[PDB]
Structures are given as structure tokens and as C-alpha cells.
Amino acid sequence: AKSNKFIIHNALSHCCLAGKVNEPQKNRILEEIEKSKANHFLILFRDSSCQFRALYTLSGETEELSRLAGYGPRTVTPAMVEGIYKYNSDRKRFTQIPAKTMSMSVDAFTIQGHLWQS
Amino acid sequence: REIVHIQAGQCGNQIGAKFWEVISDEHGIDPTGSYHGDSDLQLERINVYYNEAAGNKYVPRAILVDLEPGTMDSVRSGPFGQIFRPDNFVFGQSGAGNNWAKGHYTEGAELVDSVLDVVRKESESCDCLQGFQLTHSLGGGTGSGMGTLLISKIREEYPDRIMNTFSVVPSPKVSDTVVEPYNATLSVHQLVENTDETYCIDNEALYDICFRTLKLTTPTYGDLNHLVSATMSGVTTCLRFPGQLNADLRKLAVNMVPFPRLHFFMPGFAPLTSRGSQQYRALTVPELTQQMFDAKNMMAACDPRHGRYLTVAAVFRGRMSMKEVDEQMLNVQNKNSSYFVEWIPNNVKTAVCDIPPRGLKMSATFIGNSTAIQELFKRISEQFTAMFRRKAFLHWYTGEGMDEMEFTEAESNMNDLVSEYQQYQD
Amino acid sequence: REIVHIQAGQCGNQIGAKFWEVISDEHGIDPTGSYHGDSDLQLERINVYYNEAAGNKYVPRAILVDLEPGTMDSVRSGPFGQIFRPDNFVFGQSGAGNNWAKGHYTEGAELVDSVLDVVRKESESCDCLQGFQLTHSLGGGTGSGMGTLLISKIREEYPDRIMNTFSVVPSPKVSDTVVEPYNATLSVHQLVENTDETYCIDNEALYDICFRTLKLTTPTYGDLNHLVSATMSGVTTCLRFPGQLNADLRKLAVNMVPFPRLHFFMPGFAPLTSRGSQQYRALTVPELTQQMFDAKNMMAACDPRHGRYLTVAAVFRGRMSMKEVDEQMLNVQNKNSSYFVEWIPNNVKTAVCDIPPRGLKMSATFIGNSTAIQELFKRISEQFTAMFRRKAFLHWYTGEGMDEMEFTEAESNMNDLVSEYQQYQD
Amino acid sequence: RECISIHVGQAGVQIGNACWELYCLEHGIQPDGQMPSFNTFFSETGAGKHVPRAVFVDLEPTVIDEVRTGTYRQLFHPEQLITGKEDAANNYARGHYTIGKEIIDLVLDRIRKLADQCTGLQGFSVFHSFGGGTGSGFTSLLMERLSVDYGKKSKLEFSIYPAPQVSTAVVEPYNSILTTHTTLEHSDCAFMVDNEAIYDICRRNLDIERPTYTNLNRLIGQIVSSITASLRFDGALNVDLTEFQTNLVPYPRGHFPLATYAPVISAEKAYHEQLSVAEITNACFEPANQMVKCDPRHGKYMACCLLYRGDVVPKDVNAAIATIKTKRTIQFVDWCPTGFKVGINYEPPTVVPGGDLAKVQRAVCMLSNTTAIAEAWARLDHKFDLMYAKRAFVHWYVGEGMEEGEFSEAREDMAALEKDYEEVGVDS
Amino acid sequence: RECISIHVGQAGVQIGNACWELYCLEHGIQPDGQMPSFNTFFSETGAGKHVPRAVFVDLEPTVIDEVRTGTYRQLFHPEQLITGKEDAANNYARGHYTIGKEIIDLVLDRIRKLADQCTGLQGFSVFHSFGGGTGSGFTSLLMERLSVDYGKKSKLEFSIYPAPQVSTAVVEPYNSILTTHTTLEHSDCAFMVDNEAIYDICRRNLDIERPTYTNLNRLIGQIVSSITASLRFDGALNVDLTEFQTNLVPYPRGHFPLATYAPVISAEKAYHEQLSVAEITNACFEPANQMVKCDPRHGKYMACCLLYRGDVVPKDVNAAIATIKTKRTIQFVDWCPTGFKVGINYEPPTVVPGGDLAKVQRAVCMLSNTTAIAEAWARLDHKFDLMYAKRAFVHWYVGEGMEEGEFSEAREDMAALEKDYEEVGVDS
């Protein structure tokens, strides 16, 4: 089916999720995505500096984002979504996307900022 | 939209040694990398192939891979290695000695980790990648075995780019080792799963082209590969140089591949003639398409009249009129529609480059897909069956730590592959 | 805004022998001290380094410290000691013989009182001080031990100036004495409390830079230090020569030091290439910042990918555009932000000097702070643990009158130093 | 009083290389913008320089590289020179969905720039193909967005239909199934251009045995220049495009007109030539001059819109209309009694310096609606269903985000298209 | 009828290298003081030589060494060449308290020299940054003292705000928290300049991929020259700075306006250019032309002050204001009904010999108040609180005599700053 499953897993091993530091953290993230029957995978960041906070999945029907691992909200609406990102395999980084609908090509995103627990 | 040509083995390093020899001569460039051509066509599309240094110096974006320096030494000690940087000069010691399990599994894996870093060195210098090119043989231990570990990791790295390798099918007349069909079987077992497309190259077929059609007396490896590199350069420069039918190779890979495992191509070159027939033959497009359809102009020893054409690519070079192009393309389709698959009305993709090559005013390049490629694969399979029984010199690979059911599964993939051509043959 | 470079020991005198060798060549000055350059940049900022005498003679504001004349004799008998006045030639007899308690505690304290007077001789001649520079090794008896008494008294004199020393970290491969970890432990026990900042220098790491990256055959002491002196001159001349980002070293010390005891720096130099790749490589900022991030260009044997970057300084040389500077700086921060600390959004300080170095049109210099510097410190501690048990050759220092719990407290400071990195690593 | 031409894909920009060259031929326009006295296709600067109101779109730089380094680049601004960096790989799912979405936000913003510069926008015309990657997918992406923003504007397409015997790519029928229903959803009028019938015209009506894509669009764009710029130019009977759109399309979904033009005379044929108005309209009814490989004899004429240039006498046109009613083999419908709409330009047609048609005193463009067009669509449906039964090439759109049922649904949309002209053909 | 420009820090003097260069461009002023016929920025000597009324302040002599050995030094007097000898070490406590106290008494006396030379002082403008050492701390020291002496004069700052993605020093958010509340305490008006948004303007509106701090301030100072010298220059609608100070500031603490300017046209772009009054103001509303990395769409417009040069027709401006009301996506507040103040200069704008903008017939500066500015302050606050949680870098100020509770209090002043534009955004 249509999934960015290998693309997020390729963005996993490069720069985003682990060097040697978060190597116990990534082994949970591999264990989450293999059991996940959801197709579209979404990466939540804190800022545009590519600081990982949560890994989400798109249902497609209700257009919400559910948490499998990480620190963040339980559900995320597209109103909560401020900006969306795209990972380039060749450039090995996340590139910003202009304003559009939530599509399968969206590999990563960010939120408004007020939604964090103060 | 740039290409990296990772060359491997004794063969594919020497094969690609003739290639960039053409490419620098294609664009009129000094052996040190200085441009001396007079065309903006030779000036604008340098980016796809070369990295410009300070003071008009062009770095060939191509990697020489071997576990022995000696092939790269002869490139370096010879001409046109002076354009190459020592970062392209990566080797270990010693060689695998044409051994797959030494190259792919034990010894070459350490050097590839240094090679793939240099790939990461070049790809970060690359602004926009289009795909990666490879060149080796099927019976090459350091050529294919290292390359099978290359493409498996590059596909893990870059699932999006054009993955093509240029592999040489082992000739029944040309043999140096007996475990050469072991290496070709273990290649295709991973090359199907890891590559997007490839070509089939038979030196025995290239022997006939030089001798029966070109009337050449002493074919050397470079003279054979000069025939190859002209067909190599005929494909991708059409993506680079302008044309009316600007056909991407990725456009080609959609149009040539109906099943994602059936991606094997039959190359051909249309303006093949001897030196005496230069005064005996005029240059027309129906002269070329006749020599496109010729079984004696195929670079792989397979019968195009026995099997049936899956897909056909018509790579064209020159200032041709489309009416001469389209009708003569249709005339071949009117002639040998029985040699086609039934369920496609146009089994021929036309690809016209307006920019002519040097010397000849017009040129063309045949790329075909047929079900008769399995004929060379049955040469591989049946020779594998006898050798799997007696297991002669298998202790070379057994001490490396390989399993026989892995080899049977590799045979099973070859058992799958021959059956898949019979699906679309009839 | 002037600098005094007090050089100490067999090493740091010879290390600094290459330094002012660069500096007079940096400004085109005769070996007797006569100016022959053609730039006001080489003419206005003489004050920071040199003392102008009558008749165009420039006295190097630098002090050679040893308990043996022999190193300074070769400086004096060789070239470029002729610019040095004999007031900079201060020594006693005999040497400590690489002994800390002989150097720091008993024998060297008498000569330091003559040396600090020459400091008081020069500082009264100085109009405006900015900071005092030192250079030695950690395992140097006369280099470090005397210098630990120097900085302790200068901090009593001048608490306000920039107190930096350039100390050589002992190599696990390069050993001459066994009590070299005794010397480095007793150094950092006072170097933390007395200095403002320092660098970490490993000749074993400098072996690889000449060999793996520069492909040099025979690295001598001067050839290794010629690499060091270019990095030494790259730092402070940016304070001297004009730039868009005129960053003081005292501005640097504020930005690089979040915790006052954590002031250890990882130097790096970006334009490192062999002579063959001179014709093969273009000089760009993304070429340099790639070589800034390179672990193989680090002057200390530490893994920057293992630890996390506390603070990063980007010393730049040449006529660069800020958009090329700022975005490529951000691109590295976009690349390996996982190798940073979390609580700071910009862990990289940019420092651009507009004035280019000679020969090369652009240059760059990496100065980093990581948590993986403690890897060399665990080489110090664990070697100290075995030697504190068996107390081999400790009767040399015991007859000098030292206590073992003082060594344990010096170990405890090293026990603190590793733990303070681990508090801010994760 | 202004409109904008749109050139999407490798094909349409190469068409626009000829069109704005022909649009320079309209007034003797210099390559910088200098022309003595007209602002419909143009924006005029204060220095007396006129720039086109055009749209140049490609995901490949190379066609744009031919434009921005070729002639008339001092007429062209990089606001119009909109290029992509990654190819659509001849795909609908990359043109419409995957690759084309990264540029359309820049493109529609450039549209809102030029449309704000226009005063009295009449609409637009898009030049592309049916089976391409950029000119099919991204055009389906473009026409969807423009219909949202500008609903009450003219939505024209002059599109290239691939030959059933000549196709340069195999997925060209495989693309145009998904293209067509989305085109029918949004477009106000869509033409079909078959190069194969144009090949027959060049080898016979011009006797050119060596044509190129340059020389084909010389024939095509000369018609379109008489289609577009002439209807704003002053004549004896001034009708615009919008009065055709009600008259030529009486249908909710019927807007596939046949554009024909048959003064097609070689330079040597002009000496053995004396053609009246009626003699050209007889050549307009030739099956060899239909620009589409189709037979008008088996199709039922719904409409006939006549567009004229040059030497026109309307009383002789009234005889020529009676000549059409006299020579009847046309099978005209009973739904309209006698609707033969006439458009007349007093201005003479233009001749390319370097073209292959001689100077004529009159030029006749004929727009018609017939039911034999669906036979060419019947050529298309047989190509797709064999590929849909074998499921060949499906791994490039289920490689790029498409569904199997969407293909059959668009085939049923293609079937409903054949149901549309069936209801025209059956009922009278 | 006079005022004095003030350049504090490494940045503002480098801006002043561009400013008084542009001020020589105002009348063709020679480097000695020779100009044919204006005394507002100048003091005229007996030999007909005009010297700037400028303030040059840096604790580092090197930038001063660039000035006094560079061009225009015969214009420059050592009265204005005020340098320090010891660096501020990029510090607030050394800028405001420690190092700055040794120089400020010499500085304020030079202020009392030049202000006594002035006849009808209007005020001053200070050029600096938010996160520097000299341009933040000593500016906080300077504006505090000038408010004591000259309370009823103009207290302007055109300040540089560091990018959230580009910062040359880590302590730049750590400095600007203490800078801002002291700036809010004293200043009459303060701008924010983000080099990051200027980088987008250079690469797109001028297509310059190699800009320098010189070339940035060429853009910045050309705006400020239209801001400052043009409002005293005679035009069709002569308004000074002080009438904006009442009109653009309806608040006790609201004086953070957005300065925008978008005729930004490269020399090659100008050949295909015809931009009216309305078409430039449309480009004034572009998010790519805001000079600050911010989104105007999420902010509520409080004010819109329009400053004009060159070819201006006020009846067309009246249409252009109606065009703004027509194109409304602006979310304008209900606290003012239609307050859109216009300033018109008849005089044409100036072009730098060596600059990268071509000769235009009109230039449009726009001053605006919006509520999305606090989002950039929200970028600043997250930087400081993480450093305040770790308590990093605090020893460089506690050793210089600062208090931790002062830091959180200025953060609460920064929090109350976000409360200020919240109360604008909430209530209507």
C-alpha cells in the first residue's frame, strides 16, 4: 500500500533520530513502525532546526494524527498543524513545503507552538 | 540531474576507461580537465557529468572500485587518468580473485564502507541527482559482488534515483574460471531485487559485430568497449543534449518496464558499417532502422526473431524529419508485428535527439526488450545444475560461510526469472 | 590590545619557534626586524605583536622559558632568533628533567621570579594589554610545571586579561617517560583554576592529518607545528585584521564557555588538501565546512560524532559573502543538530575576517567544544590509577616533598572534570 | 479586453515558440518590444516595449533553456519563464499529484500577478497534449485550480491528440484516460490535434516530405493566430471567442470542436491557383483537410463556425452557404435548423518569413462539431483496456499514488464520453 | 530644522558608511564639503564645506580605523570620531554599565556640542542592533541619558533584529532581553531589521547570490534616506517625522512599526517593468517583501503610513488606497476606521553609483503596525528561557555585577511586551 515507511526509516538512520546517543530510543521506533498497520508516517518537530518530538500516523479518514512514541499531544488536527516538511533522500535533510493539503508526500511537519504544555 | 558512474572490477573499470575517454572527447576537453570545445552544448550540460574546479578543471563524477590497484594504476599511468582525482582511487589489498563470497560477503564489505563514504562525499557536492550508473561483469568477483553490496546499500540510501548497472553476460566461448556461473547466479538473485534496469552485454556477440559487420581483425578489450561506450554515450547524452523527443531515462524506465522484475534490455547501435562501405552506402533513417532490426547488430547473443519484443526504445541522433522517423517506425511495426506482444499497439518508444554526434551526420541506438534473453539465462541455470551436484571447488565458497539452499534459492529466483519471460512470450 | 606569548619547555619553545616564524612571514619582516611588506594591514597592527625600536626594528613580545639553554640556543644559533632580544633569553641550570615537582615546586620557582620581572619589564612597556598567551605540553616538566606557577602568579597580578595556554595532550602512542600522566594530572589540577581557556593538542592526531589528509611522508616537529602555528595565527589575527564579524577572543570566551570550569577547545583547520588535489578541488565555503565537520581534520584524537557539541566557533578568512556563510553554517546545523546540545538553538559562533591569508583566497578554522574531550582525559585518569597503586618512580617526586592525597585531590579534580562533561552531555 | 496564452509541457512551449513569433508577425514587432501602434496579448512598458501575456511551464529546464537562450528573450521575462527542476517522468500521477504540486503554488501566484495586470480579462487558452506528462498531469492540476479561482472566464485548450498509428510513448493512451474526465470537468472548449493528419497535409497540400515539429506548429499556430488574435482585430463582422462559446456549444458536455483550415497552398501551387470563398469551403469539407484522422462522412454535423480573413464578400459567402446546402453529404442534425455561424476579418492573413505557405488574399478557418470524434476516442479505449487487463505499467501509478478502480472509473468516464456523442448521433 | 544620525556599535557605523555615502548622493556632495546649494544633516563652514551631523561610536577602534582612513574623511571631524579602547566583549553589563561608563561622559559632551550648534533640533536616530555589545548595552546607556537631557526631542532607533535561524553570537538573545525593556522605557519609535528576510529579497528581487554587509546596508540605507532626508525635502505632500510620531503611534507603548519598501528591481528586471502606484503597494503587501521574517496574514494591521517618491499622482493614490480596501486580507483593526496616512515627495529617488537597483521613476516606503511582530519576540523568548533554565553564561554578568532576578523581570517585561500586542489583537 501507499506508505512513506522506508523513507521515514531512511530518514531515521541518517541524522534525525539517532547518532550513538538515541540508539536505545531508535530501537523502540523500529519496533513501533513494524507493528503499525497504519500507512502514512508523520514526524513532529519542535522547531525548524529539526528537533524530533513525536512520530505520528495519518488515518486518512478523519485526518488526525495518533501518537505511537515520543512526547506530544495525543491527537493533532490540521488546524494544529502549522507547517509541513519534506525529507530529501539525496540532500539528507528536511525541506519546507508551501501551503497545501495534507498529502502522502508530507514526511514531516510542525505545530503552532502554543500547544506545548507550559 | 546528475549521474555517478561507479566502475567496478577488472572489466568495468577498463570498460568505463573507454567511456569517459569518449566523454572528454565528446565535449573537447583537455586530459587535465580544461575545456577547449566551441559549443554551448558542450558547455551547458557539463554539470550532469563533471564537477568544475577552479580554473576550468572538470572532475569526472565517476568512481573506480577494485580490491587491486593495478587496473586503476594503468588508468593513472596511462592517459586520461590525470583528469581523475585520487579520491576516485580507492582500493584495498588483496583482491578477492573473482570470488563472490570473498567480495560480496567477507573482504569487500570493509572497502565499500570507505567507498560509500566517498559516495556521500560526492552526493553532498551534487545539487540534484537523477540516478547512479554502474559497470561490471556478471562473473566479476570484485566487479559484481562488491557491486551487489553497493546497490543494496545505495537502494537503502536512495530509493528514488535511477538505478542502472551495465553488466556483462558470460559468454559460452569466453571462460577463465569454472565458478563464473556461480557468480552470475548470485548477482541476479540480488540485482533483480535492487536495480531498476540493466543491460545485457555479451563479448561473444560483440566479437561478431566487429568481425562480421565491421570486418575488424584484432578486437582488443578497448576496441570492444569502444563499441560499448558509443552505445553507452548514445543513451544518456540524449537526456543531456536537446532534442524534440527529450526522453528521460526515467521516462524510458516507465515505458520499457511492464513488470517491475522484467527490466532487462537488449542494446543495439544502428550506424554500423565498415570502412570500405563508406563509399558504398548512403546515410538514411530506413538504412538505420533496417540495421536496428538486424539480429547481427545486437550486443547480446540472443535471437530477436525467436522471442517476442516486449518493449523497444528508438534512440535517435541528428537532424531528422519526424515524418521520416514516424512512418519508418510504423513500417517496421507493419513488417514484424508477429515479433511483438499482442496487448500493446505501439511496442516502440521513439527518442529523438536533435544534436548530432561528431563525424556522422546521423546516428541511432537500438534498445529492445524481448523474451529471448532467457536463452543466455538457461546457459547459466543448466551449467549451475551440474555444478550444484558435484560441488567442485565449492569449498572455496564453503569456507567463506555460505549455504547451499541460499544457492538453490538463487537458482529458484533464476527458476522464477525464466518462467516470467514465458508468461509474456505466449 | 596586545598579546604576550610566553613559550615554555622543550616543546612549546620549539612549537612557538614555528609560530613567530609565520608571523614575520605573515607581515613581510626581515629576520633582523625590518619591515618590508607593502600593506597597512601588515603595518597598523604591529603593536599587538611587536615592539617597534628605533630604525624599524620590531621586538617580538614573546618569552622563551626553559631551565636549559639548549632549545633556545638552536633558536638563537638558527635563523629568526636574531629578531629576539637577549632579554627574552632567560634560563637556569640545570633542567628539571621533565619533573613537575622539580619544575613547579622546587627548582623552577627561582627562575620564574626573574621571568615575571621580565614580564613586569614588558607589561610596563605595554600601553594596552588584552591577554597573555602560553604554549607547552601537559607532560612537560619545565613546560607545564613552571607555567602552572606562571599563570597562578599572573592571575594574582592581572585577573582581567585573557589567560590562554596551548598545551599538548599526551598521546597514547607517543611516550618517553612513565610519569607523564603524573604531569598532566597535576597540570589540569591547576590549569582549571588559573586559566580562562586552552586548546587540546594531540600529535598522534596531527600524525593522521599529515598522513591521511595531507599525504605527507616524514612529519617532523616543525612540520607538525607548522600545521599548529597556522591554526594559532588563524585565531588571533582575526582580532587584529579587519573583518565583518570582528570577534574578540574575549567575545569568543564569553560565547564558547557556558560553565566556567568547562573551557576546553577542539581546534580544526578547514583548507587541508594534498598537492595533487590542488588541481582537482575548488575552494568553496561548503567545501570548507564539510572539512570543518570532518573528524579527520580535528587536531585532537577525539570522536566528535560520539560526544555532543557544547559550543562551536567558526573562524573564517577571506572575501566571502554572508549568505554563503550564514546558510552553509545553518546547513551544518540543519545536518547534525543531533551532535549538539539541546538547550541552545545556535551552538555555532561565526567569526569572519575579511582579510585573506597569503596564497589561498579563502581559509577557515574550526574551534569546537564537545563532551568527547574526556576520552583523552580517561586516558589520563586510568593510567594514573595503576601508577598510584604501585607508586613506581614516585620516590623522585617524594624526595621533592609531595603528598599522595594531593595527587588524589588532583585525581578528584579529574574525577570532577569527567563528571562535569557527563552532566552536560546528557 | 485581454487574455493570456498558456504553454504547458514540452509540446506547448514549442508551439509557443511559433505562436509568439507569429504574434510578432501581427504588427512587425521587434525582438525588444518596439512596434508602432494594440494591447490584448501584451503589457506595454513606458519605454515603448511590449511583453507577451504568456505562461511558460515545464518541469524540465531544457525546453526553457531553448527559450531563454534563443531569440525573443528580450521580449520574455522570468516571471513567465517558469521552469521545474525534476521531470514528471511522463506521468499523470507525477504531473497532477506528485511533482507538479511543488510548482503550481508558484505558478498560480504568477497567474495572479498577470491577471491583476489585466483590465477586462476575457479568459485564457492552454496549449498542451493529451498523453504527455507535464501537458496532461499538470494541466489537469492547472485547469482544476483556475476553475476554482476564475470561474466566469474563458477556459480554452488547444490540445494535441496522439495518432493511433504514431505514438512517441506507450503510456500516452495510459495517461489520457485520467486526463480527459478532469479536462471535461473544467474546460469550456477543447480541441484535438493529430500530427498524423498534419503529416498528410504537409506531404500533399504543401508537398513537404521533410517536416519537423517546428514546421508543424507553423501550420498549427497560423490557424490559431487566425483563431485568436483575429477575433479581436477589426473586420466586417467582429465576433469574439465568447460568442462562439454559447453558439458552438449548445451542450452541457459537448465542447470538443473540430478546428479546420484549408487554404494550404505551397509557394509553387500559388501560380496554378484561383480560389474563391466557396472553393476553399469545399476544401474545408475534404477528409484530407480535417487535421484529425477521422471521417466526417460517418459523423453528424452539429455546428459549423466559419472564420474568415482577407478578401471576403458576404453576399458571396451567402452563396457559399447555399453551396454547402447544395453539395449536402454532411448529415446535419435536426436539433439546430440552419446554424452556420460566420466570422469575418477584413484584415489579410499573415505569411511567415521562412514559412511554406504562399501569400493568399483570404484565409478560412472552420470550426465544427461532429460525432465521428468518439471513433478516435474508440481508438483510445481499446489501447487502455488491453493494458488494463494485463495490468502492465500499473506499477508506475501504483508506484505514484493511484488506484485501480480510478482507472476503470475514468474508463467509465471515457465510456460516458462515448455515451455523450451517441445521444447526439442517435436522437435527432 | 536639524537632526543628528547616531551610529552605535560595529553594525551601525557600517550602516553609516552607507548612509552618509547616500547623503552625499542627495546633492552630489564632494568628499571635502563642496555642494551647490540644504542644512539639516549638515553644519556649513566658512569655506563652503559641509560636515555631517553624525555620531560615530565604537569601543573597538578597528571600525573607526576603517572610517578615519577610508573615504569621506575630509568630511569627517574627530569631534564625531568617538572611539573606545577596550571592547565591550559583546556584553550588556559591560556595554551598559562597566565599560560604557568611561566613554559616555565624553560622548554626551560631544552631543551637547553639536546640539548647541543646531538651530531648531528635531531629534535624532540611533543605528544599532538588539543583541550586540556596544549597540545594545551602551545604547541602553545612551538612550537613558538623552531622555534625561532632551525629553521633548525625537528618540528614534532603526535597530537590527537577529534571525531565529542566523545568529553570529550565542548571547544575542541573552543580550536583547535586557536591551528591550530599557529601549521601551525611553524610545519614541524603534524598528526591527532581520538580515534573513533581506537575504530573500537579494536572491529574488535582485537575484544577488553574493551579498555583503555593505550591499545589505545599500538596500537598508536607501530606504532610510527615503525615510529621513526626503521628509524634509519639498514635495507634493510635505510631512515630517514628528507628525508620524503622533499618527503612527496611538499607544503609550506600541511604537514598534514595520518599515517596508518594495520597489526592489534589478537592472535587468527594469527593462520589463512598468509598475504603477497600486502595483508597488501590492508588492508592499507581499510576505517576501516585509524585511522581517514574519507573516502579515496572522497579524492585525493597526496603521499604514505610506511614504512616496518621484512619479506620484494623488488621485491614483486614492485609487490605490481603494485598491488596498478592495484586496482585503489584511485584518485591519476597528480601533481606527480608515487611518492610512500618506506622505508624498515630488523628488525622484536616488540610485547608488555601484548599487544594484536600476533607475526608477517612483519609490514607495510603507510604515505599518501589526501584531505578528510579537511572534518574533516569541522566537526570542524560547531562546532565553532554556539558557535561563540551564543558567549558562550567567557568570559573565554576575561577575560584572548583574542579578538573576533582573533577568526574569526583563523576561516578564518581555512577557508584558507580548501582553501589549495581545491586548491589541484581542480587543477590537
Ligand SMILES: CC(=O)O[C@H]1C(=O)[C@@]2(C)[C@H]([C@H](OC(=O)c3ccccc3)[C@]3(O)C[C@H](OC(=O)[C@H](O)[C@@H](NC(=O)c4ccccc4)c4ccccc4)C(C)=C1C3(C)C)[C@]1(OC(C)=O)CO[C@@H]1C[C@@H]2O
Ligand atoms: C603554490 C602555493 O601557494 O601552494 C600553497 C598549497 O598548495 C598548500 C598545499 C599549503 C602549503 O602548506 C604546507 O604544505 C604545509 C605543510 C605542513 C604544515 C603546514 C603547511 C604552503 O606551504 C602554505 C601556504 O599558505 C600560506 O602561505 C598561508 O598564508 C599560511 N601561511 C603559512 O602556512 C606559512 C608558510 C611559510 C612561512 C610562514 C607561514 C597561513 C594561513 C593562515 C594564517 C596565516 C598563515 C600556501 C598557500 C602554499 C604552500 C607554500 C605550499 C597548505 O597549508 C596552508 C597553511 O595553506 C597545506 O594545506 C594547505 C593547502 C595548500 O594548497
Ligand SMILES: Nc1nc2c(ncn2[C@@H]2O[C@H](COP(=O)(O)OP(=O)(O)OP(=O)(O)O)[C@@H](O)[C@H]2O)c(=O)[nH]1
Ligand atoms: N505537433 C507537435 N506535437 C508535439 C510537439 N512536441 C511534442 N509533441 C507531441 O507531444 C506528445 C509527447 O508529449 P510531451 O510533450 O513529450 O510530454 P509533456 O506533456 O511535455 O510532459 P513530460 O512527458 O513530463 O515531458 C507526442 O504526441 C508528440 O507528438 C511539437 O512541437 N509539435
Ligand SMILES: Nc1nc2c(ncn2[C@@H]2O[C@H](COP(=O)(O)OP(=O)(O)OP(=O)(O)O)[C@@H](O)[C@H]2O)c(=O)[nH]1
Ligand atoms: N545588516 C547588517 N547587520 C550587521 C552588520 N554588521 C553586523 N551586523 C549584525 O549585528 C549583529 C552583531 O552585533 P555586533 O555589531 O557585533 O555588536 P555591537 O553592537 O557592535 O557591540 P560589540 O559586540 O561590543 O562589538 C548581528 O546580528 C549581525 O548580523 C552590517 O553591516 N549590516
Ligand SMILES: Nc1nc2c(ncn2[C@@H]2O[C@H](COP(=O)(O)OP(=O)(O)O)[C@@H](O)[C@H]2O)c(=O)[nH]1
Ligand atoms: N568486454 C570486456 N569484458 C571483460 C574485460 N575484462 C574482463 N571481462 C569479462 O569480465 C569477466 C571477468 O571479470 P573481472 O573484471 O576480471 O572480475 P573481477 O575484477 O575480479 O571483479 C569475464 O566474463 C570476462 O570475459 C574487458 O576489458 N572487456
Ligand SMILES: Nc1nc2c(ncn2[C@@H]2O[C@H](COP(=O)(O)OP(=O)(O)O)[C@@H](O)[C@H]2O)c(=O)[nH]1
Ligand atoms: N608537537 C610537539 N610535541 C613535542 C615536541 N617536543 C616535545 N613534544 C611533546 O611534549 C612532551 C614532552 O615535553 P617536554 O617539552 O620535553 O618537557 P619539558 O621538560 O617541560 O621541556 C611530550 O608529550 C612530547 O610528545 C615538539 O617539538 N613538538
Ligand SMILES: [Mg+2]
Ligand atoms: Mg514534455
Ligand SMILES: [Mg+2]
Ligand atoms: Mg560590534
